[PDB]
Design a protein around this ligand. Structure first.
Ligand SMILES: [Mg+2]
Ligand SMILES: [Mg+2]
Ligand SMILES: [Mg+2]
Ligand SMILES: [Mg+2]
Ligand SMILES: [Mg+2]
Ligand SMILES: [Mg+2]
Length: 157
RNA sequence: AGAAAAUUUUCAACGGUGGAUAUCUAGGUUCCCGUGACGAUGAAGAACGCAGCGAAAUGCGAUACGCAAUGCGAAUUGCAGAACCGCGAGUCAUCAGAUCUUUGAACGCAAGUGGUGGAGGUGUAAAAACCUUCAUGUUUGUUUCAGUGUGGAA
C-alpha cells in the first residue's frame, strides 16, 4: 500500500500530503465532498465540513445528480441540489486532521495551508448477494474509495 | 462572444480499475523401446486412526509421516527438545525381514446395529468381562454311516 500521488506539489517542504486507500465509504458521495473542499484554507475546510455534519450547511452535488434533493442550503453554491453525506464528510475530515498533524513534524503553520489536489478513485468493489423473485440472485456491492489530498502553503501579503 | 463554473465532449500525462502482451515450466501431448508383476499367505476399494506443536495432500497402522536390513556417511529445520561423529546424523536412498485397527471377493449368524449363537481357553463360589475358533463349492483321501442296490460262507 504505497501511495503514488498522480500530481505533485512544487515545494515539498512547503507541502503536506494525506491519502487513505480502500475505504468503505460511498464513492460518488466522497467524490463530491472532496470536490467541494478543493482550494480552501485547511481551517475553512474543517469549519465547513463540521458545519455540514451539523446540517447547517450543504455539500453541493456536482457530477452525480441522479435525483438529488433540492435544499435552500444550495444557495451558497448557485445550485439547486445538495445533501449531507455525513459518513463521507467524517472520513474526509479525519483526512484533513491527518493533514494538520502531518504538518506538525514539518514545523509548518496551519493558517497558510491551501488545498490543491483532492483525488478520489473508484476502488475495488466489495461483493455480496441479493435474493430476487423467481429464485434469481443479483449482485449487492459497495463502491469503495481511494482518496488523496495535498496542501500548499500560500502566503497572503 | 451570459466569452466564469457545472454538465456533454476530443487529445495527452499521471493515478485507479483490470490482468492482455513478452519471457519462463519438476506440466501436458505424441512416438519408439522394456517388463507384464494383483488376490483366501485376504487384492483392488472403503471406514477410523497415527506427528511435541498437523487440517489437507502423501506416508503409515496401537511397533501407526514409521520399526529391521543394506547403501550413502552428517543432518533435520517453521518453532521447541533430544539424539547422534561414527555405539553414526538424516523428512536421505535402497528394500529381500517385520508391524500390519474396522472392512471389503469377505468367512460362525446378522447389521444403518461394534448386536448374537456353538466349540475350546480363560476367569470365578458361581457369574460377568476378556480371548481363539466355525462360510460355500471342489479333487484326493481319513473316520464314522445308510441303501426291500448286487452278491453272499459259518
Ligand atoms: Mg493505493
Ligand atoms: Mg428480495
Ligand atoms: Mg493506465
Ligand atoms: Mg540407522
Ligand atoms: Mg467345506
Ligand atoms: Mg444291505
Amino acid at each position: 500500500g504505497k501511495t503514488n500521488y498522480s500530481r505533485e506539489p512544487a515545494n515539498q517542504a512547503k507541502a503536506v500530503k494525506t491519502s487513505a486507500s480502500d475505504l468503505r465509504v460511498h464513492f460518488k458521495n466522497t467524490y463530491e465532498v472532496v470536490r467541494a473542499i478543493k482550494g480552501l484554507n485547511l481551517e475553512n475546510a474543517k469549519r465547513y465540513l463540521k458545519a455540514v455534519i451539523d446540517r447547517k450547511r450543504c455539500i453541493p452535488f456536482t457530477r452525480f445528480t441522479g435525483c438529488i434533493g433540492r435544499t435552500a442550503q444550495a444557495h451558497e453554491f448557485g445550485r439547486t441540489q445538495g445533501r449531507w453525506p455525513v459518513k463521507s464528510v467524517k472520513v474526509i475530515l479525519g483526512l484533513l486532521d491527518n493533514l494538520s498533524a502531518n504538518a506538525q513534524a514539518k514545523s509548518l503553520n496551519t493558517a497558510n495551508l491551501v488545498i490543491q489536489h483532492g483525488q478520489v478513485n473508484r476502488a475495488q468493489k466489495g461483493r455480496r448477494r441479493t435474493y430476487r423473485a423467481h429464485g434469481r440472485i443479483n449482485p449487492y456491492l459497495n463502491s469503495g474509495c481511494h482518496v488523496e489530498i495535498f496542501a500548499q502553503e500560500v502566503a497572503a501579503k
